[PDB]
Design an enzyme around this catalytic site. Structure first.
Site, PDB file in Angstrom:
ATOM      1  N   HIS A   1       0.801  -1.216   0.000  1.00 33.75           N
ATOM      2  CA  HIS A   1       0.000   0.000   0.000  1.00 33.75           C
ATOM      3  C   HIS A   1       0.837   1.271   0.000  1.00 33.75           C
ATOM      4  CE1 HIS A   1      -2.457  -3.255   1.544  1.00 33.75           C
ATOM      5  NE2 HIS A   1      -3.552  -2.559   1.295  1.00 33.75           N
TER       6      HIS A   1
HETATM    7  S1  FES Z   1       1.089  -0.678   4.162  1.00 34.39           S
HETATM    8 FE1  FES Z   1      -0.662  -1.886   3.478  1.00 34.39          FE
HETATM    9  S2  FES Z   1       0.421  -3.780   3.958  1.00 34.39           S
HETATM   10 FE2  FES Z   1       2.180  -2.573   4.618  1.00 34.39          FE
END
Ligand code: FES
Ligand SMILES: CCCCCCCCCCCCCCCCCC(=O)OC[C@H](COP(=O)([O-])OCC(O)COP(=O)([O-])OC[C@@H](COC(=O)CCCCCCCCCCCCCCCCC)OC(=O)CCCCCCCCCCCCCCCCC)OC(=O)CCCCCCCCCCCCCCCCC
Ligand SMILES: CCCCCCCCCCCCCCCCCC(=O)OC[C@H](COP(=O)([O-])OCC(O)COP(=O)([O-])OC[C@@H](COC(=O)CCCCCCCCCCCCCCCCC)OC(=O)CCCCCCCCCCCCCCCCC)OC(=O)CCCCCCCCCCCCCCCCC
Ligand SMILES: CCCCCCCCCCCCCCCCCC(=O)OC[C@H](COP(=O)([O-])OCC[N+](C)(C)C)OC(=O)CCCCCCCCCCCCCCCCC
Ligand SMILES: CCCCCCCCCCCCCCCCCC(=O)OC[C@H](COP(=O)([O-])OCC[N+](C)(C)C)OC(=O)CCCCCCCCCCCCCCCCC
Ligand SMILES: CCCCCCCCCCCCCCCCCC(=O)OC[C@H](COP(=O)([O-])OCC[N+](C)(C)C)OC(=O)CCCCCCCCCCCCCCCCC
Ligand SMILES: CCCCCCCCCCCCCCCCCC(=O)OC[C@H](COP(=O)([O-])OCC[N+](C)(C)C)OC(=O)CCCCCCCCCCCCCCCCC
Ligand SMILES: CCCCCCCCCCCCCCCCCC(=O)OC[C@H](COP(=O)([O-])OCC[N+](C)(C)C)OC(=O)CCCCCCCCCCCCCCCCC
Ligand SMILES: COC1=C(OC)C(=O)C(C/C=C(\C)CC/C=C(\C)CC/C=C(/C)CC/C=C(\C)CC/C=C(/C)CC/C=C(\C)CC/C=C(\C)CCC=C(C)C)=C(C)C1=O
Ligand code: HEM
Ligand code: HEM
Lengths: 171, 32, 245, 58, 426, 460
Positions: free
Chosen positions: C195
């Site tokens: 992400h």
């Molecule tokens: S930021 Fe979404 S899994 Fe590490």
């Protein structure tokens, strides 16, 4: 409705259709005194008249509203101003002189009783009413009062405001 | 008319908009 | 004392162990209703306990009332102690008991790791990052803007051995648990790719949606980096005593 | 003459009753502290006073 | 349902609270408090069983291991299991003492009907729950109990068409049977509380600690004056039970009855049929089955015992005719020259001696029946204990026959004395 | 303050507090620092005025600092027709219910908190709303007295009044009170009209006492020319006049509109003989006395004082045991009057109860001894002056004196009683006896009594 007034005892008595008469007697003597309530009413409400006056006074040991204080104060003032018949005033003067060697003027009584406050009322009530002993008499139909007609736990816990009021609210 | 009841009504109307403002700020921050 | 009271009660005249009247007794209330008349010849009372059962303390009756209340309090206190034991049993049944803490001690040698390298190890069945930071790297990390940092409470623990500080952290992303990128050119730290969560070389949260830093791993360094004791942090658990004796 | 609204009388009576009942909060707190004391100890020395970091050499 | 007139009490929270806050109890002794002990043991059984349910996985192959492992890793679990077992024991003891006390006072009158039957039904249900509980142990004792219960259930259907399957699947303890029986045990155990509340409300209509009608009108207020005494009497009886168990049962013992609970279903296939014995409370029924080798007659004996225990007020009561009911008499008809006999009236408890003799014979017969296991291996090849047969037959006769209860001899003798005295004095 | 709050949070006395010292001061000695003023009584002055409309105002000046008394008297049961019989009773049973300016609950709370009292009493030809309270609470209280005494009845008030009247009728029937007997007596005396309407109202018309009928009654009868307002214990007449004007000035003058007027009452010599199967027989024999205007009224009162105190006790109650109770009735009306005896005794000797009773009354016509006259006059003076000593009753009689004689005569009642002589009493009673008797009898054997002609002949 009985609630829409400034008297708790009358609030309770209005909800009891068959309890007809109630009067509070204060009888002071040279050494002792008796302060209590006389009820006259239907025996079906025997457990109410039995446990009513005990509760209200005990309640004042903890909390008394200013409305009741001012109602009693105004009633006392009117009673002081209303003793206008010669016979009654003469009898009161004679009794006061007998038991105090002095005639207590209207102004002094008014000053003494007006100074009462919620805290003073609570303290006096706990001195004389909270968790104290009782003298009880029930004359008349005792079919419903024969059971528990002794100085059991209910009688001793009835002098506690909101504690032991269980038997009053039933029926 | 009472001060605190009027304040209660104002906060009732406003708090949803305050939460919307917080959500918008969170979106802006997450955008980068 | 008790002996004196027993002696006093020993010389008592009673009928077959019962203190009862030896003669008929009639009592009439002088202030009874006018219609009651005289007492009937029926002997209602066999005992005079109404008068005999008296401690003549009409003065200071409140003292005896308080004494009765105290005896009632003692009885109720015993009953409530038993009830409290029962409640302890119930609540302890619902709330589990950790009788002993299972062993988690371990050792990993970090000296072999070249400086400025991140290695993944399996500890407690979980990945963990072990890293070495040079003086230049640490100095570069310091003086950086604090706006990016998003953890005021979190701190950094740096070891002192092997001529270069050694850091051990949990290799689990705080966002959802994915494994972050080990090294990045812009900053040789950690930046999650699933992400885009961005961490620094100290594992702090810099300009990243993740709101927490990488959890730290409890460890103590000895033997100059050869013996890195690693044991899970121990938290209190009571009652700890399993046997009275 | 003193003619308070029955709203105020109800509010004051309930305030007094709440004051009376709040006195038992400490009582139940003490009962639940004497009982479940190990739970309180675990809470105090796990959240408010976290353990020390380092580990023994052995 | 016009036949059902109504309910004695409406068990609403408001009315229940009012009734229990205004209840009055007359002065009493410990003998008339076994009902409170039974109810308190029921409450503790509910609590402890709820605690146990969160530990017992209803799979037969895991119950032993789960019980063994969860006693160590979890604190107070074995304490709750011991409390549950001892609560069952004390519940049986209190219930049977209550039954004996109420039989003693001749509570088969019509005014006691609602009080009596509502109680017996509870007792009956209290039996079923216990049975289900045994099954949850998943030992060889549970296996034998389930097999016997399944055979008894299948007796009514002449062994046709597996009508037992919905509960006793295959007549064996497996996952389905254990799950169903455990859930039924929990539900019926909680239903027992409501049944006990209904019985307690009903019985207060005419409650007496002794048969003699004391003239006292004042009564104790239940909440604390009577409740404190009830709790204290419970404490005293528990102390006595602790002393008796401590001295009668040495710490290590040889040849206990729990030795048949060693075998665990699944783990051990072979069953040591030489030493088969249930808990003492179900001992009398297994003893009856051994004494009466006939299956149908044994089942009939069990059913008759329970149901005649239920219908005491009808056989022995006034019957609303005010003692003008006419019995059927085998031999007394020849002596009196009358086909039937009017029911006798003077059947007091404390005064008369025949009632006490018969009641204590019945109680001692019950105790002797529960005293030991007939040991059916050769109990019939060896002429069986005549005492067991005598006690069983006297139990059957005492419950059901009205010549051992409300006998005619007392009434006839009293009338003879009355006639003689009146003739002498005119 | 903070200290009072602390000492009230823990129910402990504050010894240093001045209020604690005042309340716990020993009753034997006066509280330190307080010494009230002393004052002497002053002669009472009475002042009467009239507004632009017909309302009248009467004030009795302060004689000594005391609670102020107020009242409103309406000349409006004689003014009730068969349509609206019992309206005044419904008004009495709900006299605190007003909805225009103040509520029933709020005006009851005013009464309760003022510490005083507020009452409503109605007779034939008069209604009277009285109140007493402290001076500083007078104004508000008057606002309640006027509205309750002048506001048209509301629908809720009439609805409550119907129920209360039904309860009152049930109670009166159950108790067999003498009020019902007097209602029957007046019915037979005047004939269900004028003074003949029952004081509690007809029971058949109770359901018809809706707000419409009550409002019609009030509109027809309540007019400014028949409204008297009274105060007692007021320092200044003009202050109370202004207080009244602020409330009753709105009422328009009734001049120029055909007034209801009161029909002259006629006396009827009827008789009633009810068989009730009562173990006791109650008889009542009455004759027409003089109205308020006649000066003989005082004499008649003396005659009553000659019976209810001295004669009727000795001649009937003491000598004969079957006489349960005997009394002398004396009612005065603006246009008529009633005087006679009401006795009650054993049914089996009903005739003996009647004859003797008549003789007693006839004895008064024969003559009065000097000692008996002096005793009766002394007793009457004692009763009247005991009534007058109380301020509320004095004010009520002041209002009634003003509305009847247009002046104040209670200041010389003692002189009027003294002026009475035995000859006047004897002549008045002899003249009264000649009137047509009104005879009522309720008992188990009233069917056997002397015929009305025989009663008259015996009275003759
Ligand atoms: S930021 Fe979404 S899994 Fe590490
Ligand atoms: C650190 C704590 C500090 C706080 C204080 C602690 C101490 C408190 C003590 C309180 C009193 C306890 C005993 C009495 C209980 C009842 C109380 C009561 O009701 O009093 C109010 C009241 C008395 O009024 P009071 O005067 O206001 O009260 C005074 C106080 O009570 C006080 O009374 P007293 O002072 O007179 O008490 C004397 C007593 C208490 O004094 C003490 O406290 C000292 C105790 C010391 C014990 C030491 C034990 C060993 C351990 C220590 C070892 C190391 C040290 C060794 C030192 C060696 C030095 C040489 O000393 C005795 O032991 C003498 C008692 C007589 C001998 C009896 C022997 C046993 C007989 C048992 C028979 C049971 C039969 C049952 C079955 C029947 C049917 C088959 O009692 C009555 O009126 C009751 C009268 C009717 C009943 C009489 C029954 C008599 C027979 C039974 C006696 C049962 C008790 C026996 C106790 C034995 C010792 C444990
Ligand atoms: C997610 C979170 C959700 C929330 C969670 C929290 C839930 C909170 C629930 C709050 C419930 C409030 C109940 C109000 C009434 C309570 C009694 C009362 O008035 O108090 C004044 C009372 C004032 O003191 P006092 O002057 O000495 O008077 C003592 C008497 O109780 C004074 O009594 P009395 O002699 O004057 O007369 C007693 C009785 C006359 O006697 C009776 O008639 C007794 C009742 C008869 C029928 C029931 C039979 C069974 C007895 C009751 C159950 C007891 C066992 C409960 C077991 C629960 C499960 C473990 O008369 C009455 O008062 C009649 C009403 C009785 C209460 C029922 C009606 C009101 C409450 C319920 C209303 C709603 C309906 C219920 C369902 C609602 C569902 C939402 O306060 C206390 O004494 C409290 C003492 C507390 C400390 C000692 C015990 C501690 C526990 C030790 C064991 C270890 C655990 C330690 C604690 C750990 C932390 C908790
Ligand atoms: C009628 C009731 C029983 C008969 C006697 C009358 C008792 C009531 C009179 C008042 C007594 C008041 C004081 C009691 C103090 C007891 C202290 C104690 O022993 O516990 C310390 C201990 C304190 O433990 P701890 O905290 O020191 O350590 C626990 C950890 N281990 C086990 C390793 C030591 O109490 C408990 O923790 C026990 C909790 C049990 C919860 C579940 C109930 C199990 C049954 C308990 C009672 C068994 C006896 C028989 C009961 C029969 C009726 C059900
Ligand atoms: C349904 C009505 C009440 C029924 C009463 C019967 C017991 C019901 C128990 C289940 C419901 C509990 C709800 C509250 C949840 C918190 C529970 C708790 O104590 O925390 C444990 C938790 C967990 O304990 P722990 O951390 O030691 O154990 C969990 C972790 N292991 C297994 C590793 C050891 O402890 C705490 O953190 C509590 C600290 C504060 C202590 C004071 C709590 C006061 C409020 C609850 C009082 C409850 C009194 C009940 C008395 C009943 C008497 C019959
Ligand atoms: C979010 C919570 C949901 C789960 C439910 C939680 C239940 C917790 C119950 C245990 C704690 C109870 C503490 C208060 C006890 C008061 C007892 C009492 O009678 O009061 C004394 C007195 C009354 O004295 P009384 O003697 O007349 O008591 C009888 C009262 N009645 C008639 C109602 C049964 O009342 C008060 O003045 C104090 C009232 C305190 C409670 C007020 C509740 C409403 C306002 C606060 C909460 C608002 C948010 C609620 C959640 C909404 C979410 C959107
Ligand atoms: C860190 C731990 C700190 C612990 C400190 C403990 C110190 C305690 C010192 C006590 C001194 C004595 C005080 C007496 C007060 C008497 C008041 C009184 O008159 O009562 C009558 C009234 C009711 O009266 P009543 O009606 O019952 O009867 C009155 C009696 N007569 C009629 C005779 C007068 O009760 C109260 O006032 C009770 C309310 C006040 C106390 C409330 C305390 C609430 C605290 C809750 C727990 C908080 C714990 C911390 C949480 C932290 C969270 C982060
Ligand atoms: C169709 C028929 C169906 C059956 C229905 C029949 C009716 C059933 C009614 C059941 C009533 C049960 C009531 C139980 C009440 C008691 C409970 C109890 O105590 O627990 C059970 C108790 C405890 O059982 P237990 O199993 O825990 O321990 C006893 C162990 N055995 C069996 C080996 C003895 O059961 C009994 O044993 C009770 C009877 C024991 C009697 C012993 C007395 C002493 C004997 C001395 C012998 C002589 C020596 C000296 C000789 C020389 C001098 C003379
Ligand atoms: C013939 O066949 C049959 C049978 O078998 C033979 C049967 O058994 C039966 C009957 C049996 C059944 C249908 C099975 C029923 C089984 C029963 C009742 C056994 C269980 C009995 C019990 C007493 C269980 C008690 C359980 C507990 C106390 C657990 C407590 C747990 C919890 C979570 C309590 C706290 C939570 C709540 C109250 C929920 C409130 C909400 C929250 C907390 C929200 C939390 C979340 C947020 C976000 C805040 C029938 C009908 C039948 O026909
Ligand atoms: C009056 C109520 C109850 C009675 C009479 C009763 C009876 C029994 C009996 C006799 C046993 C077997 C004991 C043994 O063989 O030694 C038992 C076991 C069991 N009961 Fe109950 N019970 C009751 C209530 C409950 C309740 C309410 C639950 C659950 C909510 C429950 C759950 C259990 C469990 C889980 C077992 C087996 C525990 C184990 O094997 O470890 N009981 N019960
Ligand atoms: C679990 C089973 C039972 C419970 C919980 C229970 C509960 C109670 C309780 C609390 C009482 C009041 C206290 C007392 O009288 O001792 C009582 C009385 C009574 N019980 Fe039960 N009981 C049970 C079983 C029985 C049985 C088996 C019978 C009869 C076969 C029975 C018949 C009665 C009667 C007749 C009374 C009233 C006694 C009287 O009127 O003097 N009960 N019960």
């Amino acid at each position: 409705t009985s609630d829409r007034q400034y008297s708790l005892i009358h609030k309770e008595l209005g909800n009891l259709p068959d309890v007809t008469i109630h009067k509070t007697h204060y009888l002071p003597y040279s050494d002792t005194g008796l302060f209590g309530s006389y009820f006259y009413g239907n025996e079906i409400f025997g457990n109410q008249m039995l446990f009513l006056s005990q509760m209200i006074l005990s309640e004042y040991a903890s909390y008394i509203n200013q409305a009741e204080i001012y109602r009693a104060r105004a009633k006392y003032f009117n009673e002081l101003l209303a003793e206008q018949n010669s016979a009654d005033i003469a009898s009161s003067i004679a009794t006061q002189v007998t038991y105090l060697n002095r005639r207590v003027p209207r102004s002094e009584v008014a000053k003494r009783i007006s100074s009462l406050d919620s805290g003073l009322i609570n303290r006096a009530a706990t001195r004389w009413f909270w968790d104290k002993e009782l003298a009880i008499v029930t004359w008349g139909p005792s079919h419903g009062l024969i059971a528990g007609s002794h100085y059991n736990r209910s009688i001793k816990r009835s002098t506690l405001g909101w504690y032991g009021n269980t038997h009053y609210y039933i029926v | 008319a009472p001060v605190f009841l009027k304040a209660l009504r104002y906060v009732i109307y406003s708090y949803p908009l305050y939460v919307c403002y917080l959500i918008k700020q969170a979106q802006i921050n997450a955008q980068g | 004392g008790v002996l004196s009271e027993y002696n006093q009660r020993l010389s008592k005249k009673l009928h077959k162990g019962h203190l009862v009247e030896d003669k008929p007794t009639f009592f009439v209330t002088s202030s009874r209703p006018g219609n009651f008349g005289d007492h009937i010849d029926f002997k209602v009372n066999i005992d005079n306990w109404f008068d005999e059962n008296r401690v003549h303390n009409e003065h200071e009756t409140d003292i005896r009332r308080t004494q009765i209340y105290t005896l009632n309090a003692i009885y109720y206190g015993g009953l409530l102690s038993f009830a409290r034991l029962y409640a302890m049993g119930v609540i302890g049944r619902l709330n589990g008991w950790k009788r002993y803490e299972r062993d988690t001690y371990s050792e990993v040698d970090i000296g072999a790791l070249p400086p400025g390298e991140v290695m993944q190890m399996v500890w407690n069945g979980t990945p963990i990052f072990i890293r070495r930071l040079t003086s230049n790297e640490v100095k570069e990390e310091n003086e950086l803007p604090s706006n990016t940092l998003l953890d005021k409470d979190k701190e950094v623990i740096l070891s002192d051995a092997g001529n270069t500080k050694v850091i051990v952290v949990s290799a689990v992303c705080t966002h959802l648990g994915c494994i972050p990128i080990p090294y990045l050119g812009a900053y040789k730290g950690y930046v999650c790719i699933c992400h885009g969560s961005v961490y620094d070389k100290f594992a702090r949260v810099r300009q990243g949606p993740a709101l927490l830093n990488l959890p730290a791993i409890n460890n103590s360094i000895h033997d100059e980096g050869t013996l890195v004791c690693m044991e899970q942090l121990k938290f209190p658990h009571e009652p700890s005593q399993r046997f009275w004796a | 003459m003193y003619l308070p609204t029955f709203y105020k009388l109800f509010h004051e009576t309930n305030a007094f009753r709440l004051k009376r009942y709040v006195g038992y909060g400490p009582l139940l707190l003490t009962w639940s502290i004497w009982t479940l004391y190990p739970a309180l100890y675990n809470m105090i020395y796990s959240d408010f006073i976290p353990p020390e970091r380092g580990v023994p050499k052995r | 349902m016009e036949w059902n007139k109504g309910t004695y009490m409406s068990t609403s929270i408001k009315k229940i609270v009012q009734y229990f806050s205004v209840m009055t109890v007359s002065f009493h002794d410990i003998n008339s408090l076994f009902g409170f002990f039974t109810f308190l043991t029921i409450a503790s059984q509910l609590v402890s069983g709820t605690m146990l349910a969160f530990s017992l996985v209803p799979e037969p192959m895991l119950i032993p291991m789960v019980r063994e492992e969860e006693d160590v890793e979890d604190l107070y679990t074995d304490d709750f299991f011991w409390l549950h077992e001892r609560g069952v024991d004390m519940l049986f003891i209190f219930s049977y003492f209550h039954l004996f006390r109420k039989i003693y006072l001749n509570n088969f009158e019509y005014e006691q009907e609602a009080a009596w039957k509502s109680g017996v039904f509870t007792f009956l249900l209290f039996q079923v729950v216990v049975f289900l509980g045994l099954v949850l142990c998943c030992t060889h004792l549970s296996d034998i109990t389930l097999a016997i219960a399944a055979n008894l259930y299948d007796t009514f259907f002449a062994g046709k068409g597996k009508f037992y399957w919905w509960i006793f699947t295959s007549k064996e303890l497996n996952t389905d049977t254990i799950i169903r029986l455990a859930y039924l045990h929990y539900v019926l155990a909680f239903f027992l509380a409501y049944l006990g509340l209904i019985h307690g409300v009903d019985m207060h209509y005419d409650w007496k600690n002794e048969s003699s009608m004391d003239g006292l009108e004042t009564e104790m207020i239940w909440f604390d004056e009577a409740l404190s005494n009830e709790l204290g009497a419970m404490i005293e009886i528990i102390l006595i039970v602790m002393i008796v168990c401590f001295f009668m049962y040495p710490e290590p013992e040889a040849l206990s009855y729990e030795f048949f609970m060693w075998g665990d279903i699944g783990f051990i296939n072979d069953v040591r049929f030489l030493s088969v014995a249930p808990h003492w409370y179900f001992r009398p029924f297994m003893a009856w089955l051994t004494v009466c080798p006939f299956h149908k007659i044994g089942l009939f004996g069990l059913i008759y015992y329970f149901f005649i225990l239920f219908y005491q007020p009808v056989i022995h009561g006034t019957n609303e005719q005010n003692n003008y009911t006419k019995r059927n008499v085998a031999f007394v008809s020849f002596f009196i020259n009358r086909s039937d006999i009017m029911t006798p009236k003077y059947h007091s408890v404390e005064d008369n001696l025949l009632h006490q003799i018969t009641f204590w014979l019945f109680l001692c017969s019950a105790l002797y029946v529960t005293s030991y296991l007939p040991y059916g291996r050769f109990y019939n090849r060896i002429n069986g204990n005549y005492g067991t047969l005598w006690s069983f037959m006297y139990i059957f006769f005492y419950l059901g026959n009205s010549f051992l209860r409300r006998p005619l001899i007392t009434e006839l003798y009293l009338f003879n004395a009355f006639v003689k005295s009146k003739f002498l004095k005119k | 303050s903070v200290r009072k709050a602390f000492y009230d949070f823990i129910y402990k006395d504050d010894k240093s507090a001045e209020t604690y010292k005042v309340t716990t001061a020993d009753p034997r000695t006066p509280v330190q620092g307080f010494r009230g003023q002393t004052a002497e009584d002053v002669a009472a002055k009475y002042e009467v005025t009239k507004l632009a409309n017909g309302v009248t105002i009467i004030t009795e000046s302060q004689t000594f600092p005391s609670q102020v008394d107020m009242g409103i008297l309406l000349d409006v049961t004689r003014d009730e027709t068969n349509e609206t019989s019992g309206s005044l009773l419904s008004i009495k049973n709900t006299y605190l219910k007003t909805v225009l300016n103040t509520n029933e609950t709020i005006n009851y709370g005013v009464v309760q908190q003022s510490g005083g009292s507020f009452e409503m009493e109605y007779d034939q030809e008069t209604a009277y709303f009285k109140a007493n309270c402290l001076a500083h609470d007078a104004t508000d209280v008057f606002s309640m007295v006027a509205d309750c005494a002048l506001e048209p009845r509301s629908t809720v008030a009439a609805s409550v009044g119907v129920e209360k009247n039904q309860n009152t009728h049930k109670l009166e029937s159950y108790l067999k009170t003498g009020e019902l007997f007097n209602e029957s007596v007046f019915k037979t005396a005047y004939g269900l009209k004028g003074l003949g309407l029952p004081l509690k109202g007809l029971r058949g018309n109770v359901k018809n006492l809706s707000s419409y009928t009550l409002q019609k009654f009030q509109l027809e009868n309540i007019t400014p020319n028949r409204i008297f307002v009274c105060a007692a214990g007021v320092e200044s007449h003009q202050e109370f006049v202004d207080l009244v004007q602020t409330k009753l000035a709105q009422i328009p003058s009734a001049e120029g509109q055909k007034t209801h007027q009161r029909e002259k009452s006629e006396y009827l010599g009827g008789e009633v003989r009810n068989l009730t199967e009562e173990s006791n027989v109650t008889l009542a024999l009455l004759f027409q006395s003089v109205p308020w205007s006649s000066a003989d009224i005082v004499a008649f009162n003396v005659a009553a004082a000659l019976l209810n105190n001295l004669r009727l006790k000795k001649n009937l109650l003491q000598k004969y045991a079957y006489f349960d109770q005997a009394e002398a009735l004396n009612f005065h009306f603006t246009d008529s009057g009633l005087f006679g005896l009401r006795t009650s005794g054993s049914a089996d000797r009903a005739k003996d109860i009647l004859n003797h009773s008549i003789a007693e009354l006839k004895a008064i016509a024969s003559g009065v001894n000097a000692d008996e006259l002096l005793t009766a006059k002394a007793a009457l003076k004692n009763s009247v002056l005991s009534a007058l000593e109380r301020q509320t009753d004095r004010l009520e009689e002041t209002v009634k004196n003003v509305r009847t004689f247009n002046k104040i005569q209670h200041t010389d009642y003692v002189k009027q009683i003294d002026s009475v002589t035995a000859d006047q009493v004897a002549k008045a009673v002899a003249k009264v006896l000649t009137s047509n008797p009104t005879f009522v009898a309720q008992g188990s054997q009233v069917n056997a009594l002397p015929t009305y002609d025989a009663i008259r002949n015996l009275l003759k």
